[PDB]
Ligand binder design. Structure first.
Ligand SMILES: [K+]
Ligand SMILES: [K+]
Ligand SMILES: [K+]
Ligand SMILES: [K+]
Ligand SMILES: [K+]
Ligand SMILES: [Mg+2]
Ligand SMILES: [Mg+2]
Ligand SMILES: [Mg+2]
Ligand SMILES: [Mg+2]
Ligand SMILES: [Mg+2]
Ligand SMILES: [Mg+2]
Ligand SMILES: [Mg+2]
Ligand SMILES: [Mg+2]
Ligand SMILES: [Mg+2]
Ligand SMILES: [Mg+2]
Ligand SMILES: [Mg+2]
Ligand SMILES: [Mg+2]
Ligand SMILES: [Mg+2]
Ligand SMILES: [Mg+2]
Ligand SMILES: [Mg+2]
Ligand SMILES: [Mg+2]
Ligand SMILES: [Mg+2]
Ligand SMILES: [Mg+2]
Ligand SMILES: [Mg+2]
Ligand SMILES: [Mg+2]
Ligand SMILES: [Mg+2]
Ligand SMILES: [Mg+2]
Ligand SMILES: [Mg+2]
Ligand SMILES: [Mg+2]
Ligand SMILES: [Mg+2]
Ligand SMILES: [Mg+2]
Ligand SMILES: [Mg+2]
Ligand SMILES: [Mg+2]
Ligand SMILES: [Mg+2]
Ligand SMILES: [Mg+2]
Ligand SMILES: [Mg+2]
Ligand SMILES: [Mg+2]
Ligand SMILES: [Mg+2]
Ligand SMILES: [Mg+2]
Ligand SMILES: [Mg+2]
Ligand SMILES: [Mg+2]
Ligand SMILES: [Mg+2]
Ligand SMILES: [Mg+2]
Ligand SMILES: [Mg+2]
Ligand SMILES: [Mg+2]
Ligand SMILES: [Mg+2]
Ligand SMILES: [Mg+2]
Ligand SMILES: [Mg+2]
Ligand SMILES: [Mg+2]
Ligand SMILES: [Mg+2]
Ligand SMILES: [Mg+2]
Ligand SMILES: [Mg+2]
Ligand SMILES: [Mg+2]
Ligand SMILES: [Mg+2]
Ligand SMILES: [Mg+2]
Ligand SMILES: [Mg+2]
Ligand SMILES: [Mg+2]
Ligand SMILES: [Mg+2]
Ligand SMILES: [Mg+2]
Ligand SMILES: [Mg+2]
Ligand SMILES: [Mg+2]
Ligand SMILES: [Mg+2]
Ligand SMILES: [Mg+2]
Ligand SMILES: [Mg+2]
Ligand SMILES: [Mg+2]
Ligand SMILES: [Mg+2]
Ligand SMILES: [Mg+2]
Ligand SMILES: [Mg+2]
Ligand SMILES: [Mg+2]
Ligand SMILES: [Mg+2]
Ligand SMILES: [Mg+2]
Ligand SMILES: [Mg+2]
Ligand SMILES: [Mg+2]
Ligand SMILES: [Mg+2]
Ligand SMILES: [Mg+2]
Ligand SMILES: [Mg+2]
Ligand SMILES: [Mg+2]
Ligand SMILES: [Mg+2]
Ligand SMILES: [Mg+2]
Ligand SMILES: [Mg+2]
Ligand SMILES: [Mg+2]
Ligand SMILES: [Mg+2]
Ligand SMILES: [Mg+2]
Ligand SMILES: [Mg+2]
Ligand SMILES: [Mg+2]
Ligand SMILES: [Mg+2]
Ligand SMILES: [Mg+2]
Ligand SMILES: [Mg+2]
Ligand SMILES: [Mg+2]
Ligand SMILES: [Mg+2]
Ligand SMILES: [Mg+2]
Ligand SMILES: [Mg+2]
Ligand SMILES: [Mg+2]
Ligand SMILES: [Mg+2]
Ligand SMILES: [Mg+2]
Ligand SMILES: [Mg+2]
Ligand SMILES: [Mg+2]
Ligand SMILES: [Mg+2]
Ligand SMILES: [Mg+2]
Ligand SMILES: [Mg+2]
Ligand SMILES: [Mg+2]
Ligand SMILES: [Mg+2]
Ligand SMILES: [Mg+2]
Ligand SMILES: [Zn+2]
Ligand SMILES: [Zn+2]
Lengths: 77, 181, 141, 69, 53, 110
RNA sequence: CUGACUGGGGCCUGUAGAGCACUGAUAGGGCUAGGGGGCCCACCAGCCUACCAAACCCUGUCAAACUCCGAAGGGUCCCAG
RNA sequence: CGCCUCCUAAAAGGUAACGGAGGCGCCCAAAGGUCCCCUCAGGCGGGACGGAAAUCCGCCGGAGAGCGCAAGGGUAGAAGGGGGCCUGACUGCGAGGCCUGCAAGCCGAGCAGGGGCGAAAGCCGGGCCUAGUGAACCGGUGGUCCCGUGUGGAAGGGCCAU
RNA sequence: UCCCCCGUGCCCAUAGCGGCGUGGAACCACCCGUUCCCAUUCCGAACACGGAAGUGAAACGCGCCAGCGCCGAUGGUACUGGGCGGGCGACCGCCUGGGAGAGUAGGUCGGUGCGGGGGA
RNA sequence: UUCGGAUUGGGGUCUGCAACCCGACCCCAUGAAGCCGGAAUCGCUAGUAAUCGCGGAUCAGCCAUGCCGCGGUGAAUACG
RNA sequence: GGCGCGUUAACAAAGCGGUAUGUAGCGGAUUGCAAAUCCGUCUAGUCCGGUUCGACUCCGGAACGCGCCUCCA
């Protein structure tokens, strides 16, 4: 009822922040996620909250490897 | 390796008879003896006594190997037992020590059981293994009445390379296991 | 009267009555079926009113298949209360029925018995219905 | 084989009441028993003990028959 | 934090300066915490000991 | 299903390939020992050595040390110095350890 | 000249619908751990059920907080008007 | 009445109601770092006391277990179980970003000092992740030796830590 | 350039489960031992070392099989971006562009790169 | 427990037309409770109490540890 | 309708995440007999669903019972 319910939490604005083909600088945040929905590929690091960030300047590339998961790469120029 | 008579007898009288009866074309098809696992489910040494030491010493004398402690995987009220507490012992015998223990069991341990009428022929695992249960520990030759403080039993697991009960049964009777009709 | 024995959630949102029926569109158990022609919430009371009418009309013989179940909770606010203060209390259960859904079937009766029993059962329901008999199309499914 | 925790096995003999001597390895170099596999009744075929009459519980007594037939 | 889980300071045993603040459960860990930490004053790793906050 | 052997192999090698170096992969059978230098980016083998090709016979730990020297001597002529040692399912010990020291003594940076 | 809008190209998504692989719900029948009585019998067990019901098999369904699936669209970047 | 999780929410993000359901105001000295090893729940069969269920053996079983606490996401090619050595639960910073009215909140490569584990490649600036929290003012304690009301001190302030 | 074996990749079940057959010259494995390096909360089972009496039984590799599993059209439909209408309402039609899921036919007992050893 | 002798298994004797319901006794095996008894309650003043054995009636046999008798050994205490 | 509380055996009535009482009832003692008195003994957590190794006990629901509020018009 109006006494039992009525609570919620703030929205977290998760999701992919840079899509394939976009040009990124080193440090750019690529994915915000809970757990490894996407996995860190080449020249990609993962933070303590599973945030994926670019390690070098370059071009974002997404890859699906079936049972091995979905990977995000950065290909240098 | 110590020249045990039981291992000698298996290679001299048992193996040639087994291939005669079952017609194995490979010398590795004939059932072998893998290991013997002796388990003592004490259960009385959970928290009322550290009497695991008394049983560990007795088990080491019978088999020549110091046994290992097994702990409870979870807590159960009906047994008044908590997770992680020691409630048993286990020793694994392989190779020469395996042969030595079975020779004593078949010759000087089983004959000392009260009202022995043979082993259970329906205790075969169904895939080529055997298990038997003992109630007394003083039947073993190294145990005397003087150092016996409490009565304890054990389970003995006999593991073979045989695939079926009928082939595992044949190895055991020739080895010397006496069975009820 | 039918209702679920257990429920994950006590209350449901009022959905939508769009589209033709999803499943249960062909006669599968009996010989004669009653088919819905327009959408509605069919209450548990209406289902039991229709079933008992067929039982009485089928003196001795007959087997009845009810192919719908009222799993959706139905909520109502108490009389003389204003809007707000949370969702109303559960008062009954309904089955969501869409056009083409076979609601009842009968077996073990003659043709004359089946048509009269299904006709009376339809008068207990808030929607237009039609009586159908099992055919090759039902067996083809 | 860990060291310091296992009793070292030595060659040993087990002597039975029937004079049988079994040669093995044990932690005690001389053992005496009261029954072995070569004299236990269940092993030596039947070795009928104090009970050997099959309980003779049937009519196998004939209980006289001096009475009239 | 709580009455049982308390806040504490870590003090360098060579220059006596408090360099780190942390916590512990004083029932689980009744004895004083001793840990090796970098002392920026000593510019090297030294043994630090628990002191009251 | 996977065995402890297969899980061990994956766990060790996934860590190695993360660094992006050239991996020195060692295979140790009951008879011989084999070494490859692999570039995972292209998936090609740069240099390979073994006791089977060199016909080395003797104490296995002694044999493995000479295989490491030959692989190291082969590697430097091709301009390779920096590698990562991939032990796979083997413990860093015994024959596998002897090959690593032999490679290091021959002038390989790892 | 970078704009709204539009064209091509890549990537992101879990709604509509649908489905039952998961979690719950659920109709009929078959087979049966365990239930109610039962021919009973406590010396000892099977059996009877047009009374329930676990798993399992067949047939048949439901879901905002179910998903083995999954659009139309939408978002974003690059180039072009 | 603040905070976290799911739905409503119309397949980017965001989105209301006295709409539908649940949690938090902690904790861990290891439940942290690293190296090494290991892999579940369940079912079936066998085994002294011993059973629905203790410990033991064999077979099937790919994640239905576990991961301190809600829910969701994630996860055995470990984030789960065990052991050895340790304190990086660092100091000084910080390119670049996410988020965003402000203020807050969040991720972070790399460089220097001095370390831990490892043969090494390497990893380590707490914790599988998202709740466990409170601006400024006023004052307390430790350090620093910056100011010190004619001058040298002192009183009292500042700065750094809490 | 052909074939066999060994090691390491990629695509991520059309690659799998299950059934049957086959391989020891070479390789690989099982195997023989535990003095030595190393090791078992007990066990040379595992990890490790020293070898060559035996065997391809197990494991592994290679072949055949569509029982299960997985892949899966065409056609049609559901739904729908945009444009128009109907119905008291619940809801429903038409035009234009897009277009599933399930089911059916059917397919599949992998494909491919690099290195090394051997034979033709 | 070499205390205690209940219960039960087995082998027998005798009486009686007949020992199953339902006799007594012998032998072998079994070897229960019971460690001096709660509130309470009974007998007894001397050859008495206590303790030990023996006979008789009924009666084929006997469930008699009952009853009626007989003798052996032999106390304590009574202030009031 | 809102808010708060309670359900224990023969009755009245307590504490407790793991273990009552008083008066009765029943067997014995005493008494000519009953009562009184004395010696012993004794019957449980409203129901369903959860959490937990473990629930009369902690949480959710349902039923019944009790207490207070229900006003400005
Ligand atoms: K109607
Ligand atoms: K332009
Ligand atoms: K389902
Ligand atoms: K686009
Ligand atoms: K550093
Ligand atoms: Mg709620
Ligand atoms: Mg709340
Ligand atoms: Mg909301
Ligand atoms: Mg928000
Ligand atoms: Mg939210
Ligand atoms: Mg996204
Ligand atoms: Mg973390
Ligand atoms: Mg076997
Ligand atoms: Mg509505
Ligand atoms: Mg609706
Ligand atoms: Mg359907
Ligand atoms: Mg309603
Ligand atoms: Mg409302
Ligand atoms: Mg309502
Ligand atoms: Mg319908
Ligand atoms: Mg700090
Ligand atoms: Mg390595
Ligand atoms: Mg839908
Ligand atoms: Mg679907
Ligand atoms: Mg339902
Ligand atoms: Mg059914
Ligand atoms: Mg459905
Ligand atoms: Mg729906
Ligand atoms: Mg649906
Ligand atoms: Mg969901
Ligand atoms: Mg859905
Ligand atoms: Mg332009
Ligand atoms: Mg507020
Ligand atoms: Mg707050
Ligand atoms: Mg949207
Ligand atoms: Mg998106
Ligand atoms: Mg959204
Ligand atoms: Mg608004
Ligand atoms: Mg508004
Ligand atoms: Mg409110
Ligand atoms: Mg709301
Ligand atoms: Mg919740
Ligand atoms: Mg709460
Ligand atoms: Mg909080
Ligand atoms: Mg702590
Ligand atoms: Mg943790
Ligand atoms: Mg951890
Ligand atoms: Mg799980
Ligand atoms: Mg909780
Ligand atoms: Mg989870
Ligand atoms: Mg998992
Ligand atoms: Mg695995
Ligand atoms: Mg550790
Ligand atoms: Mg430090
Ligand atoms: Mg800001
Ligand atoms: Mg950093
Ligand atoms: Mg370092
Ligand atoms: Mg960390
Ligand atoms: Mg979350
Ligand atoms: Mg959270
Ligand atoms: Mg906190
Ligand atoms: Mg102020
Ligand atoms: Mg101030
Ligand atoms: Mg201040
Ligand atoms: Mg100060
Ligand atoms: Mg002045
Ligand atoms: Mg001055
Ligand atoms: Mg001065
Ligand atoms: Mg001052
Ligand atoms: Mg100061
Ligand atoms: Mg200050
Ligand atoms: Mg400060
Ligand atoms: Mg190979
Ligand atoms: Mg596929
Ligand atoms: Mg030695
Ligand atoms: Mg084979
Ligand atoms: Mg077709
Ligand atoms: Mg199609
Ligand atoms: Mg199509
Ligand atoms: Mg449309
Ligand atoms: Mg259209
Ligand atoms: Mg739409
Ligand atoms: Mg449209
Ligand atoms: Mg179209
Ligand atoms: Mg389709
Ligand atoms: Mg399709
Ligand atoms: Mg296939
Ligand atoms: Mg006695
Ligand atoms: Mg009689
Ligand atoms: Mg007694
Ligand atoms: Mg005594
Ligand atoms: Mg009396
Ligand atoms: Mg007198
Ligand atoms: Mg008497
Ligand atoms: Mg009462
Ligand atoms: Mg009580
Ligand atoms: Mg009482
Ligand atoms: Mg009483
Ligand atoms: Mg009384
Ligand atoms: Mg009286
Ligand atoms: Mg009376
Ligand atoms: Mg009385
Ligand atoms: Mg007013
Ligand atoms: Zn003998
Ligand atoms: Zn210092």
């Amino acid at each position: 009822g109006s006494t039992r319910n009525g609570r919620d939490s703030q929205a977290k604005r998760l999701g992919v922040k840079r899509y394939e083909g976009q040009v990124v600088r080193a440090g750019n945040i690529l994915v915000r996620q809970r757990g490894t929905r996407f996995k860190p590929g080449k020249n990609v690091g993962m933070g303590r909250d599973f945030t994926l960030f670019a390690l070098v300047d370059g071009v974002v590339e997404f890859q699906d490897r079936g049972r091995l998961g979905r990977y995000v790469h950065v290909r240098p120029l | 390796p110590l020249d045990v008579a039981l291992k000698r007898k298996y290679y001299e009288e048992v193996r040639p008879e087994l291939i005669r009866r079952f017609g194995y074309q490979n010398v590795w098809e004939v059932p072998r003896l893998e290991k013997v696992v002796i388990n003592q489910g004490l259960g009385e040494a959970k928290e009322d006594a550290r009497i695991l030491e008394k049983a560990a010493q007795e088990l080491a004398l019978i088999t020549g190997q110091k046994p290992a402690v097994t702990r409870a995987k979870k807590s159960i009220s009906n047994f008044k037992l908590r997770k992680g507490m020691p409630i048993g012992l286990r020793v694994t015998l392989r190779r020469d020590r395996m042969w030595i223990f079975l020779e004593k069991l078949l010759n000087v341990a089983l004959p000392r059981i009260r009202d022995f009428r043979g082993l259970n022929p329906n205790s075969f695992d169904g895939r080529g293994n055997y298990n038997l249960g003992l109630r007394e520990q003083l039947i073993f030759p190294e145990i005397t009445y003087d150092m016996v403080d409490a009565l304890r039993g054990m389970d003995i697991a006999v593991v073979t390379t045989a695939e079926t009960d009928e082939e595992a049964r044949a190895l055991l009777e020739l080895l010397g296991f006496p069975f009820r009709k | 009267m039918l209702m679920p024995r257990r429920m994950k959630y006590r209350k449901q949102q009022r959905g939508r009555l769009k589209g033709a029926t999803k499943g249960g569109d062909y006669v599968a158990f009996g010989d004669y079926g009653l088919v819905a022609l327009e959408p509605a919430w069919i209450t548990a009371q209406q289902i039991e009113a229709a079933r008992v009418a067929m039982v009485r009309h089928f003196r001795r013989g007959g087997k009845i298949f009810i192919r719908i179940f009222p799993d959706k909770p139905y909520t109502k606010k108490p009389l003389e209360v204003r809007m707000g203060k949370g969702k109303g209390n559960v008062e009954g259960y309904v089955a969501v029925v869409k056009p083409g859904r076979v609601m009842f079937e009968v077996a073990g009766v003659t043709e004359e018995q089946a048509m009269e029993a299904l006709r009376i059962a339809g008068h207990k329901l808030p929607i237009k219905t039609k009586i159908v008999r099992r055919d090759a199309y039902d067996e083809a499914q | 084989m860990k060291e310091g925790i296992h009793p070292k096995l030595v060659p040993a003999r087990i002597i039975c009441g029937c004079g049988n001597v079994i040669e093995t390895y044990s932690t005690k170099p001389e053992i005496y028993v009261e029954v072995c596999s070569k004299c236990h009744p269940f092993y030596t075929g039947q070795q009928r003990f104090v009970d050997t009459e099959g309980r003779v519980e049937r009519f196998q007594r004939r209980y006289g028959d001096s009475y009239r037939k | 934090a709580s009455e049982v889980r308390i806040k504490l300071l870590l003090e360098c045993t060579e220059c006596k300066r408090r360099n780190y603040a942390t916590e512990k459960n004083k029932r689980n860990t009744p004895n004083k915490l001793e840990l090796r930490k970098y002392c920026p004053w000593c510019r090297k790793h030294t043994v630090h000991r628990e002191v009251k906050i | 299903r996977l065995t402890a052997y297969e899980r061990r192999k994956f766990r060790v090698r996934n860590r190695i390939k993360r660094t992006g170096r050239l991996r020195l992969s060692v295979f140790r059978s009951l008879k011989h020992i084999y070494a490859q230098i692999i570039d995972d980016e292209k998936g090609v083998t740069l240099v390979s050595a073994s006791s089977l090709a060199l016909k080395l016979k003797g104490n296995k730990t002694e044999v493995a040390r000479q295989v490491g020297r030959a692989l190291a001597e082969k590697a430097l002529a091709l301009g390779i110095k920096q590698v990562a040692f991939d032990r796979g399912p083997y413990k860093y010990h015994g024959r596998v350890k002897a090959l690593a020291e032999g490679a290091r003594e021959g002038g390989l940076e790892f």
